[PDB]
Each structure stands twice: as structure tokens, then as C-alpha cells.
Design a protein that fits this description.
The complex is a heterodimer of chains A (about 425) and B (about 160).
Chain A (H helix, E strand, L loop, with lengths): L9 E4 L16 H5 L5 H8 L2 H10 L12 H9 L5 E7 L8 H8 L1 H15 L1 E8 L4 H16 L15 E6 L9 H8 L23 E5 H5 L1 H12 L10 E8 L5 E6 L4 H8 L9 E6 L3 E4 L20 E5 L4 H15 L5 H18 L5 H11 L9 H5 L2 H9 L1 H5 L3
Parallel strand pairs in A: 1-7, 2-3, 2-5, 3-4, 6-10
Antiparallel strand pairs in A: 6-7, 8-9, 8-10
Chain B lengths: L4 H11 L9 H12 L7 H8 L3 H10 L11 E6 L2 H6 L1 H12 L12 E6 L10 E4 L2 E4 L3 H8 L4
Helix pairs in contact in B: 1-2, 3-4
The chains are: A alpha/beta (about 425), B alpha+beta (about 160).
The structure holds nicotinamide-adenine-dinucleotide (NAD), flavin mononucleotide, iron/sulfur cluster and FE2/S2 (inorganic) cluster (FES).
Protein name (chain B): NADH-quinone oxidoreductase subunit E
Catalytic activity (chain B): a quinone + NADH + 5 H(+)(in) = a quinol + NAD(+) + 4 H(+)(out)
GO molecular function, one term (chain B): metal ion binding
């Protein structure tokens, strides 16, 4: 009944789907959930074949909400071609700077998440499912354990769910300070009781995941879309937003905005609209210097008119919007991104291990005026050579945003030389 | 070394929760840090036995995960976010206020073993920057007077 204190993050929706309840900053229990027609998509899904469900999710055009945007129906198809037992995992690791969209679903509408997990589990024929939540979300952990007990009590979990013959247990696991555990293979290793070290892919988890068995890993926000897909049908779900990037999308907006929070909008929305039409514009009406797409991209004030979709000229990522204004030093900002990667490399890969450490160590020297001409030249080189031999996406991106700032704001960088 | 029945039951509860005992390592460690206010080195051998894992395994895990500290004992762990958004919104003002109130800087513990400042990466509450946690409880920093009232709730 009494959970740890959690900040009341502002949430706003134009679609009233993923945020229908989670727009209110409080735990919505099972009776409140059922009252809104909750768990009725589950009832409908149990009457359908697991294959029908996969087909509906494919046709809905739902793409992964955990940053890479892979087609979900397709991912489920890949797993089902290899024999069972199969495992379903909810990625609730959310450790990306500026990303706090998944936590409001967990903490405020846990049953929306649970419901998606059960439909998704039934779809791939997983009789065992996991929620891997980060250790810095203890309230979300207790909210989920309590809600899982509520669903088990109402007969949505256990053996022979609602007389369908489908069995399911959802287990809740906790991370412990490792960003890399959000990477699916490192997450699986951590579920097995080991260190969060990513495995070499291929094999992809759908072939060999948890206990070497076919495993589907999906993000909190992705799963939360599944009860909506089943309830309204794929056709009517495809009506939301543009037809090429359809469905609701959560955008966590922070930094130098008047109204920081999570916004549920269609993916046809421009970055400009997100900042000025929805987040109420910049704090103090200062001009936007840049926008950081998590610890991944940097968008100058010249690129605000781009769509918030999965297109090549689109914003992409998790739709994380960190707004920087004219008085914010880009080199001071880039140092904070470098520090993040230095702190998060698992160290398996030598160029990632040394590259992430060196980029932050040298950039700090740049900022504090301790930089020699060789530290400057070495910084540039190390920033371009973190990716070689890397087996996971971390090494591949560690220098991406920092490279972008160098190319987009040379003046501010040259002042430090 | 023997865990009190208060903690031993909780550990078995976590160990019997997942299909395999070894999967409960992170949950067990979290419970060990909650009880002792750190990870005692002596507690690693009994846990390795309960998990049916070798000692080297458990030691490697405690070392790998940042939420674990086998050095200092603190009743309250003030986790302070030092990432991009919190930095932009006033992490320095939060750390300066903390230093004025408790006399300690990040990485230090108060003389009474009550409070420890832990610099952490993004806590995923960036809209509420500057963010800090006091054990499991999470808050947005407004001011030293505000902060002072929050900290006073920790006895
Ligand atoms: N939401 C967050 O909190 C958060 C935090 C950090 C990073 N991320 C995101 O993570 C992304 C990088 O993730 P990634 O390296 O997992 O991406 P990826 O492109 O390699 O793969 C994404 C997904 O598709 C599946 N997949 C890809 N190719 C496949 C194939 N041929 N067969 C079967 N399955 C296949 C994978 O199993 C995985 O689940 C970044 O864009 C970043 O934004 C998100
Ligand atoms: C270093 C790293 C960290 C990641 N962290 C997360 C995370 O916190 N949450 C998440 O859902 N996906 C994260 N991902 C992406 C996952 O590996 C994976 O693609 C995703 O969970 C699959 O779900 P989706 O298809 O629904 O998007 C991370 C990837 C990398 C490379
Ligand atoms: S690229 Fe870096 S984070 Fe990824 S597996 Fe290699 S060492 Fe670990
Ligand atoms: S940057 Fe501090 S909570 Fe995200």
C-alpha cells in the first residue's frame, strides 16, 4: 500500500491511449483498471489463435519503442519458427539520459503493461515471462509485484488462464546500476544470475536467449501498445498518426522547456511542435541552441521541423527530447555525455573500454584548460575509434553525439583550442 | 557468520521466487545492502552457498554492479544524479546545499554513519531535474530550505 516517494512527472496526451490513466500521477489498481474495460483485450486474445495475434501486431506496423525500432510482429515471427519452451521479457531497464517514458506506465498503469505481457506471451507461446526493471526504480518494482498479485488473484495469471489452457507466470527482476543491462543479451545474462555482459549477435535472442531458448525481448512502451492493437483491431490502430509510422508514441521532454514531462502524440508531430506547441516553449523564451536525442543525437536549431518518427530524416531513437538554450555550453554538455559512456562501458571490447575512458578523460582536460595539443589531437582520434571490434550498440554510439556537436557547432569547440 | 532470521527468510524467499536459485543474486544483494547499510565482505560466502554458486562468481557480481558498496556503511544513501539534464538544471546547487547541511561532498559519509553521497548516472526523472534519491525515495531539488526539510525526515 505504501510505496517509496516518486516525483510527480507531468504527463499529457492528445490520443488518450497509453496515458488514458497514466496522465494522473498515481497507482491505478486492478478494480480501477477493470472499470475502464481493462483485461478485456486479454479475454478477446485468449479466444484467438496465437498466430492471429502475431499477424495483427505485424499488420498494425508496431515497431520497437526501445530505440532501435524493429518491427514487433516480425520479431515474434522469428522466435516462433524455433521450437519451445519460449521466454518473453519486458525490458524495463530505462537508463538512457533524458528517457523517463517507461516508468510512468509502470508506476501509474501497471495493469496496461501486465495485460500486454500476457497477450504477448500467449502469442509466442511463452509460459514464463520476465520484467527486468532497473534498480533505481524500487517503487516501480513494488508496484509491479503488487499488481501481478492482483492479476493472479483475478485469474489472469497462473495455470489455465480463464479456461484457455494457457499457463503464465511473470517474474520481476531488478538491475543494480548497470546501463548495459538494458542491452537485451546483457539483460538475459543478468537474468541468469551473471554479469551484464552482452553476447555476440547473431545469434539473436529469438533463436538463443534465456537458457539458450527462443526469447523475445520487448520494451515497456512497445508491450503497452499490444492491448490497444487487440481491442480496436489493427486497421483502426493504423488510423492513429501517419500510415507509415502509426500508433501512439510517448515523448519524454526535459531541459530548458516551460512544461517538462511525457507527451503522448502521433509520430507525424515535428520536434518544433513538441517544444513550442506542447512543452510550452523554452524557459525564459530563450532561443534553442540544440536538442539532444538522449545520449545518441544532437539536432541544431536548424533541424526542428523534422518528424518525430522512425524515418531516416526523422528524429528516431526513443523520442527523448533534451532541449538546450543559447547560454548552455555545448562542450560542457558533450563532457557529460562522454562521462556517461566512460561510466557505462562493460569493458569487454578493448577500443570501447579505452575509447570511452579516454574520450571523457581528454574532453575534461579540454574543458578545464589542462589540454595539450596532443590531448586535443588524441581526443579527436579516440572519438572516431570506439566502434572497432564492438559486439554491442554501446561502442557503436559512444562518440556519435559528440562527433555531431563538433560538426554542427565548430565555433564553441575552437574556443577551447 | 550467520544472517539473522529477519534477513535469512527474505533471502530464501527471493531464492525460491525464480525457477532457478542463481537468478536471485541481485535481489539477495539488494536485501543485504538494505539490512546492513552496505555489503559486508563476510556475507558473500553464506550467500554463495545459499545460491549454490562458487564464491568467485558472487564477488565478480558485487564488483560489476554499481548499486553495491562493500566499502562504507551508511543508514541513508543520498544518490545524486550527475548526468546531462541534472547538470544543466542545477546539480551543483544541490551538491552545494548538501555540503552546507551535512558537511560532506560526493563519495563521503557523515561522521555518525547516517548519510553518504553517491554520484550516480541519469535516474530517469529528467523532467524533475535536479534529481536525488534518499535510499528508495526520489525527489526534485528545489532549494536548500526544501532539501533541509526532506533530509530531516531521515532519523
Ligand atoms: N529506452 C531506453 O531506455 C534505451 C536506453 C538505451 C538505449 N536504448 C536504444 O537502444 C538502441 C540500440 O539497440 P540494439 O543494439 O538492441 O538494436 P538492434 O538494431 O541491433 O536490434 C533491435 C531489436 O531487433 C532484434 N533484431 C534485430 N535484427 C534481428 C534479426 N535479424 N533477427 C531477429 N531479431 C533481430 C533484436 O533482437 C532487438 O530486440 C538505440 O537506438 C537506443 O536508442 C534505449
Ligand atoms: C547499451 C544499450 C542499452 C539499452 N537499454 C535499453 C533500455 O533501457 N530499455 C529498452 O527497452 N531497450 C534498451 N536497449 C535496446 C535493447 O537491446 C532492445 O533492442 C529492446 O529492449 C528490444 O525491445 P523493442 O523491440 O520493443 O524496442 C538498449 C540497447 C543498448 C545497445
Ligand atoms: S561495445 Fe562496449 S559496452 Fe558493448 S559489449 Fe563491447 S565493451 Fe561492452
Ligand atoms: S539526467 Fe538526472 S534524472 Fe535524467
Amino acid at each position: 500500500r505504501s510505496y517509496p516517494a516518486i516525483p510527480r512527472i507531468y504527463a499529457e496526451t492528445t490520443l488518450n491511449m497509453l496515458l488514458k490513466r497514466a496522465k494522473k500521477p498515481r497507482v491505478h489498481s486492478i478494480d480501477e483498471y477493470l472499470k475502464d474495460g481493462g483485461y478485456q483485450a486479454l479475454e478477446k486474445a485468449l479466444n484467438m489463435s496465437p498466430e492471429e495475434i502475431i499477424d495483427w501486431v505485424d499488420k498494425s506496423t508496431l515497431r520497437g519503442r526501445g530505440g532501435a525500432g524493429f518491427p514487433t510482429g516480425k520479431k515474434w515471427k522469428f522466435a516462433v519458427q524455433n521450437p519451445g519452451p519460449r521466454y518473453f521479457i519486458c525490458n524495463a531497464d530505462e537508463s538512457e539520459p533524458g528517457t523517463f517514458k517507461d516508468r510512468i506506465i509502470i508506476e501509474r498503469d501497471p495493469h496496461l503493461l501486465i495485460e500486454g505481457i500476457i497477450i504477448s506471451s500467449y502469442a509466442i507461446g511463452a509460459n514464463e515471462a520476465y520484467i527486468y526493471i532497473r534498480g533505481e526504480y524500487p517503487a516501480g518494482y513494488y508496484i509491479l509485484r503488487d499488481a501481478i498479485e492482483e492479476a493472479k488473484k483475478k485469474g489472469f495469471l497462473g495455470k489455465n488462464i480463464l479456461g484457455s489452457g494457457f499457463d503464465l507466470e511473470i517474474y520481476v527482476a531488478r538491475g543494480a546500476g548497470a546501463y548495459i543491462c538494458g542491452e537485451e543479451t546483457a539483460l538475459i545474462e543478468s537474468l541468469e544470475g551473471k554479469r551484464g555482459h552482452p553476447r555476440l549477435k547473431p545469434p539473436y535472442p529469438v533463436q538463443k536467449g534465456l537458457w539458450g531458448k527462443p526469447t523475445v525481448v520487448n520494451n515497456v512502451e512497445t508491450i503497452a501498445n499490444v492491448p490497444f492493437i487487440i481491442s480496436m483491431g489493427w486497421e483502426e490502430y493504423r488510423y492513429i498518426g501517419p500510415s507509415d509510422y502509426a500508433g501512439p508514441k510517448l515523448f519524454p521532454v526535459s531541459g530548458k522547456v516551460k512544461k517538462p514531462g511525457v507527451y503522448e502524440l502521433p509520430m507525424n508531430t515535428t520536434l518544433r511542435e513538441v517544444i513550442f506547441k506542447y512543452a510550452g516553449g523554452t524557459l525564459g523564451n530563450k532561443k534553442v541552441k540544440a536538442v539532444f536525442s538522449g545520449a545518441l543525437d544532437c539536432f541544431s536549431s536548424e533541424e526542428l521541423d523534422i518528424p518525430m518518427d522512425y524515418s531516416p530524416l526523422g528524429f528516431g531513437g526513443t523520442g527523448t527530447v533534451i532541449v538546450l538554450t543559447e547560454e548552455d555550453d555545448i562542450v560542457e554538455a558533450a563532457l557529460k555525455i562522454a562521462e556517461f559512456y566512460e561510466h557505462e562501458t562493460c569493458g569487454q571490447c578493448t577500443p570501447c573500454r579505452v575509447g570511452c575512458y579516454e574520450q571523457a578523460n581528454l574532453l575534461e582536460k579540454i574543458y578545464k584548460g589542462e589540454a595539450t595539443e596532443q590531448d586535443w589531437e588524441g581526443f579527436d582520434f579516440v572519438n572516431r575509434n570506439i566502434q572497432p571490434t564492438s559486439i554491442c550498440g554501446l561502442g557503436a554510439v559512444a562518440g556519435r553525439l559528440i562527433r555531431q556537436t563538433l560538426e554542427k557547432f565548430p565555433e564553441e569547440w575552437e574556443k577551447y583550442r | 557468520f550467520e544472517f539473522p532470521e529477519e534477513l535469512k527468510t527474505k533471502l530464501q524467499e527471493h531464492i525460491n521466487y525464480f525457477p532457478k536459485k542463481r537468478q536471485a543474486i541481485l535481489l539477495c544483494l539488494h536485501e543485504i545492502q538494505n539490512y546492513y547499510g552496505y555489503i559486508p565482505p563476510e556475507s558473500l560466502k553464506p550467500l554463495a552457498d545459499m545460491l549454490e554458486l562458487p564464491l568467485n562468481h558472487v564477488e565478480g557480481v558485487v564488483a560489476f554492479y554499481d548499486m553495491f558498496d562493500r566499502e562504507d556503511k551508511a543508514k541513508y544513501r543520498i544518490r545524486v544524479c550527475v548526468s546531462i539534464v541534472c547538470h544543466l538544471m542545477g546539480t551543483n546547487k544541490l551538491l552545494k546545499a548538501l555540503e552546507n547541511i551535512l558537511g560532506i561532498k560526493p563519495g563521503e559519509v557523515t561522521p555518525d554513519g547516517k548519510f553518504k553521497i553517491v554520484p550516480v548516472q541519469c535516474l530517469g526523472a529528467c523532467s524533475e531535474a535536479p534529481v536525488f534519491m534518499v535510499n528508495d525515495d526520489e525527489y526534485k531539488f528545489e532549494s536548500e530550505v526544501q532539501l533541509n526539510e526532506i533530509l530531516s525526515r531521515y532519523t
